[PDB]
Amino acid sequence: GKGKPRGLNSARKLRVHRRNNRWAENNYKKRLLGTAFKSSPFGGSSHAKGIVLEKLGIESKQPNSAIRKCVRVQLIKNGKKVTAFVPNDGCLNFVDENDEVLLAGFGRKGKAKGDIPGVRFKVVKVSGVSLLALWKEKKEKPRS
Amino acid sequence: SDAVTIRTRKVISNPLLARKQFVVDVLHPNRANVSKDELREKLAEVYKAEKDAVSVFGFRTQFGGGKSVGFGLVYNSVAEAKKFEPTYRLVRYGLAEKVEKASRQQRKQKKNRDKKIFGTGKRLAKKVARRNAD
């Protein structure tokens, strides 16, 4: 009998069973409860500007050993505080104290990339200027 | 233009505007283009009308040069042409003069300024002058 109702007038039972079982699906439940809107630091936005509160060194997870360079940053639009990796060599020097930075995700949706523990966001633009532009010297940080 | 041999197609006559209208094309090999005057004079002589009586417009030069197509409109009289053509096309043809209406923003400003005044305002001008003197 395969456990599910087969009868021709049983569409209601199948529909509510499907509804009751849809909730065990990870992304669907998040979409309906609006957790991305409600709880996620960006409120569903792909990017968000914030002020760097402080610089941070975060030791990498095993088997790797290094100190990834991050920043504790308070978002403009929520006030929520987020750690953000500064994704290139020596770019932690470009990020000073109290700059306005742009933050983007790490690609691993709402998760942590690789060996960096708990850092779910990365800085993209520093004081309105691009990190890789600064890192390849195609632009100069205004320093103001 | 060298070997214009201007051709005219779909030459339907409209007594409503009292004219003959056709799709005109001009072949101008080895020459860039042909102008309004040179088109109108040739069309005028072939249709037995004055240079002004015939109107042509909408000339798009087809790729590679060689020929263009426009729209031709030969009227039954100069008076018919004067009544029926738009003023922009008449001044385009040089027969008429550009109307001297002011810009839209200045024109609209005039409307809204005079909207604030009820009637002639001659009495108001006298009263404002008396108070300003006072």
Partner: protein
């Protein structure tokens, strides 16, 4: 082990050799033609299998 300063160590320590001037490579269809001769008619790249960037052995 351990550093919050000295960020940018190898990036600043690398001895920068500038790019060598060279004839500009063709663009577009010219470049595709260049690839075609490089990888089909100049069969001189096979060592047994058609390598594309062999090392200077």
């Amino acid at each position: 082990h351990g550093s919050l300063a000295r960020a940018g160590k190898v990036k600043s320590q690398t001895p920068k050799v500038e790019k060598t001037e060279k004839p500009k490579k063709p663009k577009g269809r010219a470049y595709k033609r260049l690839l075609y001769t490089r990888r089909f008619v100049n069969v001189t790249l096979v060592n047994g299998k058609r390598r594309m960037n062999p090392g200077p052995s």
